[PDB]
Design an enzyme around this catalytic site. Structure first.
Site, PDB file in Angstrom:
ATOM      1  N   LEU A  22       0.841  -1.185   0.000  1.00 35.71           N
ATOM      2  CA  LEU A  22       0.000   0.000   0.000  1.00 35.71           C
ATOM      3  C   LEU A  22       0.882   1.243   0.000  1.00 35.71           C
ATOM      4  O   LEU A  22       2.021   1.202   0.476  1.00 35.71           O
ATOM      5  CB  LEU A  22      -0.915   0.028   1.218  1.00 35.71           C
ATOM      6  CG  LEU A  22      -1.825  -1.188   1.388  1.00 35.71           C
ATOM      7  CD1 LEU A  22      -2.604  -1.036   2.686  1.00 35.71           C
ATOM      8  CD2 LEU A  22      -2.769  -1.314   0.203  1.00 35.71           C
ATOM      9  N   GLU A  30      -9.070   0.615   8.418  1.00 43.13           N
ATOM     10  CA  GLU A  30      -9.352   0.460   6.995  1.00 43.13           C
ATOM     11  C   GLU A  30      -9.239  -1.004   6.596  1.00 43.13           C
ATOM     12  O   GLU A  30     -10.065  -1.523   5.833  1.00 43.13           O
ATOM     13  CB  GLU A  30      -8.390   1.334   6.178  1.00 43.13           C
ATOM     14  CG  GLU A  30      -9.023   1.974   4.924  1.00 43.13           C
ATOM     15  CD  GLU A  30      -9.281   0.955   3.824  1.00 43.13           C
ATOM     16  OE1 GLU A  30      -8.368   0.148   3.516  1.00 43.13           O
ATOM     17  OE2 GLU A  30     -10.404   0.960   3.271  1.00 43.13           O
TER      18      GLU A  30
HETATM   19  N1  LIG Z   1      -5.415   0.207  -2.124  1.00 39.84           N
HETATM   20  C1  LIG Z   1      -6.199  -0.886  -2.622  1.00 39.84           C
HETATM   21  O1  LIG Z   1      -7.372  -0.884  -2.474  1.00 39.84           O
HETATM   22  C2  LIG Z   1      -5.484  -2.021  -3.306  1.00 39.84           C
HETATM   23  C3  LIG Z   1      -6.144  -3.145  -3.744  1.00 39.84           C
HETATM   24  C4  LIG Z   1      -5.440  -4.150  -4.359  1.00 39.84           C
HETATM   25  C5  LIG Z   1      -4.048  -4.036  -4.557  1.00 39.84           C
HETATM   26  N2  LIG Z   1      -3.385  -2.928  -4.104  1.00 39.84           N
HETATM   27  C6  LIG Z   1      -1.959  -2.757  -4.334  1.00 39.84           C
HETATM   28  O2  LIG Z   1      -1.873  -2.577  -5.932  1.00 39.84           O
HETATM   29  C7  LIG Z   1      -0.842  -3.277  -6.381  1.00 39.84           C
HETATM   30  C8  LIG Z   1      -1.309  -4.530  -7.143  1.00 39.84           C
HETATM   31  O3  LIG Z   1      -2.251  -4.085  -8.095  1.00 39.84           O
HETATM   32  P1  LIG Z   1      -1.819  -3.993  -9.701  1.00 39.84           P
HETATM   33  O4  LIG Z   1      -2.759  -3.091 -10.476  1.00 39.84           O
HETATM   34  O5  LIG Z   1      -0.357  -3.584  -9.800  1.00 39.84           O
HETATM   35  O6  LIG Z   1      -1.920  -5.565 -10.354  1.00 39.84           O
HETATM   36  P2  LIG Z   1      -3.169  -6.650 -10.395  1.00 39.84           P
HETATM   37  O7  LIG Z   1      -4.323  -6.194 -11.195  1.00 39.84           O
HETATM   38  O8  LIG Z   1      -3.501  -7.216  -9.073  1.00 39.84           O
HETATM   39  O9  LIG Z   1      -2.391  -7.859 -11.173  1.00 39.84           O
HETATM   40  C9  LIG Z   1      -2.041  -7.568 -12.475  1.00 39.84           C
HETATM   41  C10 LIG Z   1      -1.963  -8.922 -13.183  1.00 39.84           C
HETATM   42  O10 LIG Z   1      -3.039  -9.628 -12.933  1.00 39.84           O
HETATM   43  C11 LIG Z   1      -3.709 -10.001 -14.336  1.00 39.84           C
HETATM   44  N3  LIG Z   1      -4.865  -9.124 -14.501  1.00 39.84           N
HETATM   45  C12 LIG Z   1      -5.189  -7.943 -13.979  1.00 39.84           C
HETATM   46  N4  LIG Z   1      -6.393  -7.596 -14.465  1.00 39.84           N
HETATM   47  C13 LIG Z   1      -6.820  -8.589 -15.283  1.00 39.84           C
HETATM   48  C14 LIG Z   1      -7.989  -8.744 -16.027  1.00 39.84           C
HETATM   49  N5  LIG Z   1      -9.113  -7.840 -16.129  1.00 39.84           N
HETATM   50  N6  LIG Z   1      -8.161  -9.831 -16.755  1.00 39.84           N
HETATM   51  C15 LIG Z   1      -7.189 -10.800 -16.781  1.00 39.84           C
HETATM   52  N7  LIG Z   1      -6.060 -10.657 -16.060  1.00 39.84           N
HETATM   53  C16 LIG Z   1      -5.886  -9.533 -15.303  1.00 39.84           C
HETATM   54  C17 LIG Z   1      -2.741  -9.865 -15.217  1.00 39.84           C
HETATM   55  O11 LIG Z   1      -1.885 -11.038 -15.007  1.00 39.84           O
HETATM   56  P3  LIG Z   1      -1.124 -11.802 -16.250  1.00 39.84           P
HETATM   57  O12 LIG Z   1      -0.021 -10.893 -16.787  1.00 39.84           O
HETATM   58  O13 LIG Z   1      -0.502 -13.046 -15.616  1.00 39.84           O
HETATM   59  O14 LIG Z   1      -2.146 -12.089 -17.292  1.00 39.84           O
HETATM   60  C18 LIG Z   1      -1.925  -8.681 -14.699  1.00 39.84           C
HETATM   61  O15 LIG Z   1      -0.605  -8.725 -15.088  1.00 39.84           O
HETATM   62  C19 LIG Z   1      -0.057  -3.662  -5.130  1.00 39.84           C
HETATM   63  O16 LIG Z   1       0.786  -2.631  -4.868  1.00 39.84           O
HETATM   64  C20 LIG Z   1      -1.171  -3.777  -4.065  1.00 39.84           C
HETATM   65  O17 LIG Z   1      -0.545  -3.625  -2.718  1.00 39.84           O
HETATM   66  C21 LIG Z   1      -4.103  -1.930  -3.496  1.00 39.84           C
HETATM   67  C1  LIG Z   2      -6.773  -2.928   3.232  1.00 39.53           C
HETATM   68  C2  LIG Z   2      -6.478  -2.409   1.804  1.00 39.53           C
HETATM   69  C3  LIG Z   2      -7.728  -2.374   0.952  1.00 39.53           C
HETATM   70  N1  LIG Z   2      -8.707  -1.547   1.362  1.00 39.53           N
HETATM   71  C4  LIG Z   2      -9.815  -1.479   0.637  1.00 39.53           C
HETATM   72  N2  LIG Z   2     -10.792  -0.654   1.065  1.00 39.53           N
HETATM   73  N3  LIG Z   2     -10.043  -2.171  -0.488  1.00 39.53           N
HETATM   74  C5  LIG Z   2      -9.089  -2.993  -0.897  1.00 39.53           C
HETATM   75  N4  LIG Z   2      -9.301  -3.697  -2.024  1.00 39.53           N
HETATM   76  C6  LIG Z   2      -7.874  -3.116  -0.186  1.00 39.53           C
HETATM   77  O1  LIG Z   2      -6.908  -4.000  -0.664  1.00 39.53           O
HETATM   78  C7  LIG Z   2      -6.978  -5.301   0.018  1.00 39.53           C
HETATM   79  C8  LIG Z   2      -6.186  -6.346  -0.758  1.00 39.53           C
HETATM   80  C9  LIG Z   2      -5.939  -7.557   0.137  1.00 39.53           C
HETATM   81  O2  LIG Z   2      -4.805  -7.188   0.964  1.00 39.53           O
HETATM   82  C10 LIG Z   2      -4.585  -7.906   2.149  1.00 39.53           C
HETATM   83  C11 LIG Z   2      -5.596  -8.700   2.660  1.00 39.53           C
HETATM   84  C12 LIG Z   2      -5.391  -9.413   3.828  1.00 39.53           C
HETATM   85  C13 LIG Z   2      -4.176  -9.315   4.476  1.00 39.53           C
HETATM   86  C14 LIG Z   2      -3.165  -8.519   3.965  1.00 39.53           C
HETATM   87  C15 LIG Z   2      -3.356  -7.800   2.790  1.00 39.53           C
HETATM   88  C16 LIG Z   2      -2.278  -6.909   2.196  1.00 39.53           C
HETATM   89  C17 LIG Z   2      -2.121  -5.545   2.905  1.00 39.53           C
HETATM   90  C18 LIG Z   2      -3.395  -4.716   2.664  1.00 39.53           C
HETATM   91  C19 LIG Z   2      -0.912  -4.779   2.268  1.00 39.53           C
HETATM   92  O3  LIG Z   2      -0.791  -4.827   1.015  1.00 39.53           O
HETATM   93  O4  LIG Z   2      -0.196  -4.195   3.112  1.00 39.53           O
END
Ligand SMILES: NC(=O)c1ccc[n+]([C@@H]2O[C@H](COP(=O)([O-])OP(=O)(O)OC[C@H]3O[C@@H](n4cnc5c(N)ncnc54)[C@H](OP(=O)(O)O)[C@@H]3O)[C@@H](O)[C@H]2O)c1
Ligand SMILES: CCc1nc(N)nc(N)c1OCCCOc1ccccc1C[C@H](C)C(=O)O
Ligand SMILES: [Cl-]
Length: 186
Positions: A22, A30
């Site tokens: 994150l 959160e």
């Molecule tokens: N703040 C939040 O709410 C939140 C939520 C989730 C994650 N995160 C953070 O965001 C980052 C990860 O997210 P990201 O955008 O970089 O990657 P992601 O979407 O989780 O993964 C990307 C990979 O997954 C596949 N993919 C994604 N969308 C697809 C779709 N519509 N259809 C088919 N395959 C799909 C593809 O894999 P292939 O190349 O193998 O096809 C793509 O290379 C991390 O830093 C995580 O900590 C934050």
């Molecule tokens: C809390 C962040 C968030 N909040 C909102 N509202 N919607 C989201 N989709 C979202 O992402 C969640 C993805 C799942 O992450 C998990 C889940 C269980 C344990 C540990 C992690 C990784 C932790 C967050 C990291 O990456 O430090």
């Protein structure tokens, strides 16, 4: 199979991730909100389905994969089988949603929650039909390398309140944030 929802936490500059983590330091409530919203099922005997991209899967600590109390599904066209700890893998969101019509999921799944990342949110937010976006607005800028697509306010309505969701400003570790809920039905 119940409703289709996205859930995300996003900084003021639309960031959702940085170097596989994150962008902000851990915000306990959160996290608790994310856990409770995606785990809680309205239907006895069912669990919710969480759909995530490959990078989001590996961003979860190994001790916490798969997400407990929920059916986990990973999206990827590169993987040939669900990663260790997972049991479902689809090539696209469209394929994943069609998979919920087959007996292995139709009997077990209540709500469907898209939990990231960027390209999964993009496919879902353009998906036709009833969709809700549960968006946590983190009220600061954070350095990010992964972003949330801007919400089309010609398609979505912002709800002033949603049941069980506090509508006031939250604060942890010096960081203010707000829970928002958007809805469309095209
Ligand atoms: N703040 C939040 O709410 C939140 C939520 C989730 C994650 N995160 C953070 O965001 C980052 C990860 O997210 P990201 O955008 O970089 O990657 P992601 O979407 O989780 O993964 C990307 C990979 O997954 C596949 N993919 C994604 N969308 C697809 C779709 N519509 N259809 C088919 N395959 C799909 C593809 O894999 P292939 O190349 O193998 O096809 C793509 O290379 C991390 O830093 C995580 O900590 C934050
Ligand atoms: C809390 C962040 C968030 N909040 C909102 N509202 N919607 C989201 N989709 C979202 O992402 C969640 C993805 C799942 O992450 C998990 C889940 C269980 C344990 C540990 C992690 C990784 C932790 C967050 C990291 O990456 O430090
Ligand atoms: Cl927006």
């Amino acid at each position: 199979v119940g409703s289709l929802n996205c859930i995300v936490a996003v900084s003021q500059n639309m960031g959702i991730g940085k170097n596989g983590d994150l962008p902000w330091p851990p915000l306990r409530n959160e996290f608790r909100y994310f856990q409770r919203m995606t785990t809680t099922s309205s239907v006895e005997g069912k669990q919710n389905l969480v759909i995530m991209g490959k990078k989001t899967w590996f961003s979860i600590p190994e001790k916490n994969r798969p997400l407990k109390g929920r059916i986990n599904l990973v999206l990827s066209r590169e993987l040939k089988e669900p990663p260790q700890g997972a049991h479902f893998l689809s090539r696209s969101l469209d394929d994943a949603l069609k998979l919920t019509e087959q007996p292995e999921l139709a009997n077990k799944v209540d709500m469907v929650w898209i939990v990231g990342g960027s390209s999964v949110y993009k496919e879902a937010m353009n998906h036709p039909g009833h969709l809700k976006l549960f968006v946590t607005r983190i009220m600061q800028d954070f350095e990010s390398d992964t972003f949330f697509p801007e919400i089309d306010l010609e398609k979505y309505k912002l709800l002033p309140e949603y049941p069980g969701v506090l509508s006031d400003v939250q604060e942890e570790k010096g960081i203010k944030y707000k829970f928002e809920v958007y809805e469309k039905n095209d």
